[PDB]
Amino acid sequence: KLAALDPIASQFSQLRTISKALGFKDAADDVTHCLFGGELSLSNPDQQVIGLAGNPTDTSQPYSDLAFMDMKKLAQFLAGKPEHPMTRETLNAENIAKYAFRIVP
């Protein structure tokens, strides 16, 4: 079937990364919840787990305060309101990589 490629969520694989090893407690009871609701897990096949910073930095200085979330939910939010969900500063496809870090094992 036809499927949309979201202009923001399609950047997930290009993001700067931060290892699983900031309060992230993967689900698989103290667990980190996404900003938009529900527990987060690197093993959840339907989530793209990121940390979203409150201030931007150039695409690749590594990370140096994050909100954890599912980028899929973030992209849906930003398509309707292109603003950082906490600071309300402009946030869109153009600058998401300056704010978002993909969490890896």
UniProtKB/Swiss-Prot annotation:
- Reported effect, residue 25 to R: No effect in ubiquitination
The listed locations are: Secreted
Site residues by UniProt (E2-binding): 36, 77, 85
Q: What is the effect of changing residue 77 to A?
A: Loses ubiquitination activity
Task: Cite the post-translational modification comment.
Answer: Auto-ubiquitinated.
For the region Required for E3 ubiquitin-protein ligase and anti-PCD activities and pathogenesis, what residue ranges are annotated? 65-81
What induces this one?
Transcriptionally induced by HrpL.
Q: Which function does this protein serve?
A: Effector protein involved in gene-for-gene resistance in tomato plants. It is recognized by the host Pto resistance protein and elicits Pto and Prf-dependent hypersensitive response (HR) and programmed cell death (PCD), resulting in host immunity. In susceptible plants, acts as a virulence factor by suppressing PCD and HR-based plant immunity. This function requires its E3 ubiquitin ligase activity probably by recruiting E2 enzymes and transferring ubiquitin molecules to cellular proteins involved in regulation of PCD and targeting them for degradation.
Q: What is annotated about its quaternary structure and interactions?
A: Interacts physically with plant cell Pto.
- Family classification: Belongs to the HopAB family.
| Further facts | Unlike many effector proteins, it is widely conserved among diverse genera of plant pathogens including Xanthomonas, Erwinia and many strains of Pseudomonas.
Q: What is this protein called?
A: Effector protein HopAB2
Q: Which organism is it from?
A: Pseudomonas syringae pv. tomato (strain ATCC BAA-871 / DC3000)
The primary gene name is hopAB2
First and last residues shown, out of full length:
436 to 553 of 553
